[PDB]
Every structure is written in C-alpha cells, then in structure tokens.
mmCIF file of C-alpha atoms and ligand atoms in Angstrom:
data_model
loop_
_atom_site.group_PDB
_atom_site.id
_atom_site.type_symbol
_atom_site.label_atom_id
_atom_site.label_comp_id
_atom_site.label_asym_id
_atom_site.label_seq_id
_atom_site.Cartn_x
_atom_site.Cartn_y
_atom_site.Cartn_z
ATOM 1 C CA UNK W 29 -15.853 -5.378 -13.558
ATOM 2 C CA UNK W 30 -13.779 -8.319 -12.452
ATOM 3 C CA UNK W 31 -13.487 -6.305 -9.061
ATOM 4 C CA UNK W 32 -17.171 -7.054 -8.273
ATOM 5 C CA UNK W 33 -17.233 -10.554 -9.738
ATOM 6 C CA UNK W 34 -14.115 -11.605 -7.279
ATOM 7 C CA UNK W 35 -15.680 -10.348 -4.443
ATOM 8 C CA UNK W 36 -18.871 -12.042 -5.001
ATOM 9 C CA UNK W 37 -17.247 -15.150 -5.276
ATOM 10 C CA UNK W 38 -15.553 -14.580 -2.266
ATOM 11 C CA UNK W 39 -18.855 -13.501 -0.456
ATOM 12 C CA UNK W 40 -20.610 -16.789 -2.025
ATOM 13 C CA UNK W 41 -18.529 -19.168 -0.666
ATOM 14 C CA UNK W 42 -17.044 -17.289 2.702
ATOM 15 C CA UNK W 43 -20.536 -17.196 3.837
ATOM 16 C CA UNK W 44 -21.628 -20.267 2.551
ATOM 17 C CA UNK W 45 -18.752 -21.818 5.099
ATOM 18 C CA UNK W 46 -20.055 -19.714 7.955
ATOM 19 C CA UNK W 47 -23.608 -20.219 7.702
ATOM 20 C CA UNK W 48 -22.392 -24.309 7.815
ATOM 21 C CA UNK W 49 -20.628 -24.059 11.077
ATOM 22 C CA UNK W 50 -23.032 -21.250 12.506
ATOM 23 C CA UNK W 51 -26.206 -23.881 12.216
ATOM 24 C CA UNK B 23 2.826 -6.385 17.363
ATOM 25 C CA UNK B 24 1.222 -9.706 18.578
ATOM 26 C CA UNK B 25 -1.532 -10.077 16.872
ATOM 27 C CA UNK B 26 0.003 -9.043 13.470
ATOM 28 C CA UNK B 27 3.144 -11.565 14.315
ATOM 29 C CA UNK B 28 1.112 -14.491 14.875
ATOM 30 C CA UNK B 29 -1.288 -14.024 12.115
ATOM 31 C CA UNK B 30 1.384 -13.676 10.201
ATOM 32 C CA UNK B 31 3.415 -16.807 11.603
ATOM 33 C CA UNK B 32 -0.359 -18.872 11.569
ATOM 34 C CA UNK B 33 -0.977 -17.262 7.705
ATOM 35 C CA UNK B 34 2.520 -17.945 6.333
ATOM 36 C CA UNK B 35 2.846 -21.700 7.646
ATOM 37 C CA UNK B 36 0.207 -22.848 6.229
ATOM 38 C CA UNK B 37 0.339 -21.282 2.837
ATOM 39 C CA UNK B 38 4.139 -22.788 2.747
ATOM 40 C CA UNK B 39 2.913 -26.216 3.542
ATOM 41 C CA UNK B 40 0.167 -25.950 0.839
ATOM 42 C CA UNK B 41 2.278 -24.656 -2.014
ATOM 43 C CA UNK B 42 5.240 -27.424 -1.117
ATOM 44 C CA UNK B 43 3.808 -30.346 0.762
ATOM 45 C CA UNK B 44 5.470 -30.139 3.838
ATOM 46 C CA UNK B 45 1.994 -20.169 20.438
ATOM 47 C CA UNK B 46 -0.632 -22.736 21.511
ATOM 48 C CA UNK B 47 -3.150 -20.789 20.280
ATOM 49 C CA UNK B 48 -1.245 -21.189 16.797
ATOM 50 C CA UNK B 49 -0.668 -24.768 16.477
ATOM 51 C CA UNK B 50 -4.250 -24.594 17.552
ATOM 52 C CA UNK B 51 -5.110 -22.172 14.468
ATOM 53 C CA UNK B 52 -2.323 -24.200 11.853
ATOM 54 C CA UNK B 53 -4.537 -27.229 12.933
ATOM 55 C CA UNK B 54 -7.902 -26.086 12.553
ATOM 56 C CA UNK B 55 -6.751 -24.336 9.023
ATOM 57 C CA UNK B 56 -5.426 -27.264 7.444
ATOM 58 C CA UNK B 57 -9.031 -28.767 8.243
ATOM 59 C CA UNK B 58 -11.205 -26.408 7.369
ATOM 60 C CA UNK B 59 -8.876 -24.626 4.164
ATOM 61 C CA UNK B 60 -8.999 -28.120 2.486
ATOM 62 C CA UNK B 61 -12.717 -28.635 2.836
ATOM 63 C CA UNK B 62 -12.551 -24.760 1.273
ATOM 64 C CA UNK B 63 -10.358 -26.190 -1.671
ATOM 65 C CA UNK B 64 -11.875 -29.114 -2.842
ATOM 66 C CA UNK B 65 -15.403 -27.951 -4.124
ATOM 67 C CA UNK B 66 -14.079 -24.707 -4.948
ATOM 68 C CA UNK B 67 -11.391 -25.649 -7.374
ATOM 69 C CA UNK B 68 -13.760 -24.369 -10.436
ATOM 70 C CA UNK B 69 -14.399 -21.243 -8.601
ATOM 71 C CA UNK B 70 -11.144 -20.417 -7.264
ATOM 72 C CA UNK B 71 -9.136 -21.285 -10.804
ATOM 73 C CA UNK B 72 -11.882 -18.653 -12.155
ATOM 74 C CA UNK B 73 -10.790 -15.741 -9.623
ATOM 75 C CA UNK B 74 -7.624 -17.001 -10.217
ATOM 76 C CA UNK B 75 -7.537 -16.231 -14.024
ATOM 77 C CA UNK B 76 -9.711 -13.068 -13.403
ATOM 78 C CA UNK B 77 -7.257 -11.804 -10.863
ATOM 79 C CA UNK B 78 -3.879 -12.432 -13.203
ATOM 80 C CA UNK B 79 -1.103 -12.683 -10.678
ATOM 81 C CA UNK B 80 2.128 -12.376 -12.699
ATOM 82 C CA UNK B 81 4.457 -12.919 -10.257
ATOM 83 C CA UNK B 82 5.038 -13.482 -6.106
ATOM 84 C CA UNK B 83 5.145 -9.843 -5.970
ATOM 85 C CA UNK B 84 1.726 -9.267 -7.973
ATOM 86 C CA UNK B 85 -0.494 -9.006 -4.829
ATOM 87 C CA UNK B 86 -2.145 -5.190 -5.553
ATOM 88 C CA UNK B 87 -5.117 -6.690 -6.733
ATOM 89 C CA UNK B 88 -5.916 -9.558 -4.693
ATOM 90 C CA UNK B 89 -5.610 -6.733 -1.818
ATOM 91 C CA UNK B 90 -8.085 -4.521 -3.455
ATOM 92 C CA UNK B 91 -10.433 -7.714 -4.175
ATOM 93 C CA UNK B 92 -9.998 -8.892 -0.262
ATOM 94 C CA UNK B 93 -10.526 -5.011 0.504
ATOM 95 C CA UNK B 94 -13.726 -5.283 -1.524
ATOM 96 C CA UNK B 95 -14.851 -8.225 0.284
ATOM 97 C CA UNK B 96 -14.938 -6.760 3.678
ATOM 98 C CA UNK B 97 -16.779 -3.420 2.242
ATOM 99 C CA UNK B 98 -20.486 -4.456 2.776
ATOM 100 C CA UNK B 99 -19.331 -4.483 6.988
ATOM 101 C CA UNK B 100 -19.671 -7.928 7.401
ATOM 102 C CA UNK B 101 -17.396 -9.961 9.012
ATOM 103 C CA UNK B 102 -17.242 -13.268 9.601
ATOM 104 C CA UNK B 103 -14.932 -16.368 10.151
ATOM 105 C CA UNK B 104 -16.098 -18.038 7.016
ATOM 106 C CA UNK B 105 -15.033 -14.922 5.050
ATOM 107 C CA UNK B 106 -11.897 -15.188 6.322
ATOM 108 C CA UNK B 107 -11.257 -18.509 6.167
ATOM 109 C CA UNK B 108 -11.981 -18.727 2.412
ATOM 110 C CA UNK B 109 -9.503 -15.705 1.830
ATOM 111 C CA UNK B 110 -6.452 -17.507 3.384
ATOM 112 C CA UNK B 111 -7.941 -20.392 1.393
ATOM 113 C CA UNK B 112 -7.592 -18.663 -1.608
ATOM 114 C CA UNK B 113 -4.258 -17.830 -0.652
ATOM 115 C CA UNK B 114 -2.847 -21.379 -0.405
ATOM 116 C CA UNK B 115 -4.509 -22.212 -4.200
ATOM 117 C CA UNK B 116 -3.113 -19.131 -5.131
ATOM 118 C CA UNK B 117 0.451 -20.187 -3.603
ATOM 119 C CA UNK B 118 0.197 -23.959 -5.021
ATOM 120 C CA UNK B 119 0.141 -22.125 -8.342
ATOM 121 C CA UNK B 120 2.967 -19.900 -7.893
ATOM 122 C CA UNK B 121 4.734 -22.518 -7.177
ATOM 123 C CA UNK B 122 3.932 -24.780 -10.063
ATOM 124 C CA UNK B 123 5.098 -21.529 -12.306
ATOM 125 C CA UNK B 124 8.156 -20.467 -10.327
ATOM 126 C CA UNK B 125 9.589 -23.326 -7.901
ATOM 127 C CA UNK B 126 11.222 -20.956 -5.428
ATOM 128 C CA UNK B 127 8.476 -18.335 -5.402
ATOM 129 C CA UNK B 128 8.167 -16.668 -1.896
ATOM 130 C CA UNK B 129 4.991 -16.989 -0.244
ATOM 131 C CA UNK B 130 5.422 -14.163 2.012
ATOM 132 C CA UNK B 131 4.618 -11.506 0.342
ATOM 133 C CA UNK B 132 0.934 -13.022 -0.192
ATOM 134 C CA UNK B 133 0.937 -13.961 3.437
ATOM 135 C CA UNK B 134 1.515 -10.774 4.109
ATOM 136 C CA UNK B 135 -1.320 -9.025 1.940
ATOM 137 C CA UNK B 136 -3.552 -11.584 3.581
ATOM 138 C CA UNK B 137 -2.303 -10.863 7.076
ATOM 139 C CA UNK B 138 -2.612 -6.835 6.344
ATOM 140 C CA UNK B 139 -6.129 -6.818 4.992
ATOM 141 C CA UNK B 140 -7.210 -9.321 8.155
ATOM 142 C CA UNK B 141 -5.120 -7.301 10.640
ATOM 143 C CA UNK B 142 -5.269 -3.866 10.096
ATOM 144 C CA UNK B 143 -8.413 -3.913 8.760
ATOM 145 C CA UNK B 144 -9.993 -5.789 11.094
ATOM 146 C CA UNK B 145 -8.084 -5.260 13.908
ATOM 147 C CA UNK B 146 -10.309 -4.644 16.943
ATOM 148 C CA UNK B 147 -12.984 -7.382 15.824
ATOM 149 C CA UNK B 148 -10.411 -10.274 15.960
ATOM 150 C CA UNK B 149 -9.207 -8.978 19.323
ATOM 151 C CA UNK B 150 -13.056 -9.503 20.573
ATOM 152 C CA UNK B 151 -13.408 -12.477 19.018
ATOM 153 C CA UNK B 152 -10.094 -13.130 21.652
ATOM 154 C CA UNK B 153 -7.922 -13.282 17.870
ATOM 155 C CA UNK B 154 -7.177 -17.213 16.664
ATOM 156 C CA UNK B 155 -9.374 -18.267 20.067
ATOM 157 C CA UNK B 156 -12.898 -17.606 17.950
ATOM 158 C CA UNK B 157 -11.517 -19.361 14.665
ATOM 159 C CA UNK B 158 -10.710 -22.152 16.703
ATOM 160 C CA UNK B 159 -13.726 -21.971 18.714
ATOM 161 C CA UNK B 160 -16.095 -21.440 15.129
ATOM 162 C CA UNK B 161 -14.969 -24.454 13.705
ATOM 163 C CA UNK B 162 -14.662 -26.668 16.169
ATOM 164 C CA UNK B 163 -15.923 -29.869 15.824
ATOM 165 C CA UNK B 164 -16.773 -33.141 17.751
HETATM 166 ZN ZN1 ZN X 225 -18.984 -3.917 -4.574
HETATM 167 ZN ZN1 ZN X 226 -19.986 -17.591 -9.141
HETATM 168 ZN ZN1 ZN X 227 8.408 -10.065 3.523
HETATM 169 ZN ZN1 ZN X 228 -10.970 -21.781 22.926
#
C-alpha cells in the first residue's frame, strides 16, 4: 500500500525532528 | 475561528513564499517555519520526491490523498511538533512543484488540507500547547 509507506515516511522523519529538539 | 484563521494565515504564507520566492504570535510562527521547514527540506529531498511520486498530485485541487496520508499519520495517537512540522514541510515541496508544472497554481487549497487535518483534528492539543506559542517555544533556539 502506498498509504502505509507515506505515512511511515512521514513518521520517520517527523519524529526524527522532534526527538532532535526534545534532547 | 482563531485558531483555524491563523493557522491558516501562518500555513498559507509560508507555502506561497516557498513555491515563488518571495498576529505576533504569527510572524513568530512564519519565522520559526522558514527555519526549521528548510532544515526539513534539504536532507529530505530523496524522501519527499519519493512520497511525492507515490502520492501523484495531478493538479492544485488533487489534495484527497495527501489528506488521507496526513490522516494516517496522526492514527497511531501521537502527536508531536516534529510531525507537524514535517507535514507543512511537505507541503511547501509539494507547492514548489506545483508551481514548476502550473505557474499560477493556487496554494490554498493545500494550505487548507494541511490547516484542516492540524486543526480539526487536533484541535484541543494545539490549544494546550497555547496553539503557535509551543511550536515556537519547541524549536527555539539560542
Ligand atoms: Zn497504518
Ligand atoms: Zn523510507
Ligand atoms: Zn480556498
Ligand atoms: Zn513563548
């Protein structure tokens, strides 16, 4: 599903920017 | 409403700026977006041209599925600022390149599936983070 792999993306690099500016 | 206008207003003016090159709390929000939506950008231009392809927007108008991708997103019941910044992120890419096929493309109605998902579907969480006050805050840096 290109659904799921969009969203993962998303996911990937959303919370790869929050965990950044959390720490 | 407030919160939906200014979102919108914050959303829309800096998705404009991307695809051409051109209150307080908003200039605050325009400011820390153009910052932080860059850094999003560069080192995700492989990435986002893949979603991009994947998602096949035909037109300014062709904003059904990024909706139901950005509803996906938010599914699992996490929220978080980083989410959301890479979704309006993905909005300006995705506005640079309607642009570049269509000169006089509208961004609005993409700022407005952006501001929809963000607002009405996380309504009440933005108003505790005190709205564009906690993006601000989150990314703030010395
Ligand atoms: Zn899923
Ligand atoms: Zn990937
Ligand atoms: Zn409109
Ligand atoms: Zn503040």
């Amino acid at each position: 599903r290109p659904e799921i792999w969009i969203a993962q993306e998303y996911r990937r690099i959303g919370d790869e920017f929050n965990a950044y500016y959390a720490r | 409403d407030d919160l939906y206008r200014q979102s919108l207003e914050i959303i829309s003016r800096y998705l404009r700026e991307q695809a051409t090159g051109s209150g307080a709390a908003g200039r605050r929000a325009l400011e820390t977006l153009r910052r932080v939506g860059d850094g999003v950008q560069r080192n995700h231009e492989t990435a986002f041209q893949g979603m991009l392809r994947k998602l096949d927007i035909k037109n300014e108008d062709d904003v059904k599925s990024l909706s139901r991708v950005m509803i996906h997103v938010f599914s699992d019941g996490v929220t978080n600022w980083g989410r959301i910044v890479t979704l309006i992120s993905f909005g300006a890419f995705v506005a640079k390149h309607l642009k570049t096929i269509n000169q006089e493309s509208c961004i609005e109605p993409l700022a407005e599936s952006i501001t929809d998902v963000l607002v009405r579907t996380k309504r009440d969480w933005l108003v505790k983070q005190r709205g564009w006050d906690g993006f601000v805050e989150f990314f703030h840096v010395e």
